[PDB]
Amino acid sequence: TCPFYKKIPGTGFTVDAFQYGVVEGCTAYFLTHFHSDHYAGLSKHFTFPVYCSEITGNLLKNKLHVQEQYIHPLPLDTECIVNGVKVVLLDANHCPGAVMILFYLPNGTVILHTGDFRADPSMERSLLADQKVHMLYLDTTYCSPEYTFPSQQEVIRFAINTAFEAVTLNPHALVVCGTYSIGKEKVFLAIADVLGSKVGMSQEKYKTLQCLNIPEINSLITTDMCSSLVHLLPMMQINFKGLQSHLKKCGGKYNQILAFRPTGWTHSNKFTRIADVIPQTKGNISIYGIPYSEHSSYLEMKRFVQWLKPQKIIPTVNVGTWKSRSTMEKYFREWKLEAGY
Ligand code: NI
């Protein structure tokens, strides 16, 4: 049964609630972004409206094969009417096509649903700046003060240098990057770009990227592996046994892989900086973990919420245990008491 934190009061709207069957009363199903926890349940056999970004639309049409009529894409940053309710989609700074949704209720209540987001100061000068938000449905993935990580730009800086160093030291080395969903495309695109290459990948991954409205994408990616010295592999595959395997397949064209595993937070964030990172090494295969996050750090989230001063906050992540719920409320109270809302 669809939980109360996927439902928008005073509408027939639900958010990311595609895995329960028909939800009684639901006229419209919003999808914040194309990640499988959020879309779980969609298929070619959905015959209710889906509202989503253009980019999310493309992924629904081409990867899940939903029929063009049931996908309603909306532009961003545009006041739009949806069954006589004003809504706005805003960039979530998560993965490609990811949105937050502003709901303007008939009664005068205004609700923000973040989806998955990485909060940023640029959102404080968006349409959000213009009016009071009473309710906040919040991505709480990293709602705990241990959760720090560097900026995306810091990480991209690191990766670019590492890659360029080695390739200039040994020109028969291969860069590999792990991946399992959309998100984090800048890792492999920045590397490829410093190396004078396209990125090579499987046909299914190429198809996924061709939906994302990346500009000049045809000049950045290919399905021809042999021609490319930045490759993408399934994240499962980024280990010694699976890389060794892959080092064979290229057929004596490279003598060293330098792989990057973009990860979320890991406990080595608690003791080690980004400039002081190392990889695991079994012979000629070195695997970097690099903490490129597409979710708010604790401090980023804290700041966004303290600027927003919502009358009420409803968590969408880590809501499955009473301990997490109780812990999170404690942080929301401190924030509100510090900030005087
Ligand atoms: Ni996500």
Curated annotation (Swiss-Prot):
Induction remarks: During mitosis. The mRNA encoding this protein contains an internal ribosome entry site (IRES) in its 5'-UTR. This 5'-UTR generally suppresses translation while specifically promoting expression during mitosis, when cap-dependent translation may be impaired.
Signal peptide range: none
Expression across tissues: Expressed in brain, heart, kidney, liver, pancreas, placenta and skeletal muscle.
Annotated localization: Nucleus
Function summary: May be required for DNA interstrand cross-link repair. Also required for checkpoint mediated cell cycle arrest in early prophase in response to mitotic spindle poisons. Possesses beta-lactamase activity, catalyzing the hydrolysis of penicillin G and nitrocefin. Exhibits no activity towards other beta-lactam antibiotic classes including cephalosporins (cefotaxime) and carbapenems (imipenem).
Sequence similarity: Belongs to the DNA repair metallo-beta-lactamase (DRMBL) family.
Quaternary assembly: Binds constitutively to TP53BP1. Binds CDC27, which is itself a component of the anaphase promoting complex (APC). Binds PIAS1.
Name of protein: DNA cross-link repair 1A protein
Organism from which the protein derives: Homo sapiens
Gene: DCLRE1A
Residues of the whole record sequence present: 700 to 1040 of 1040
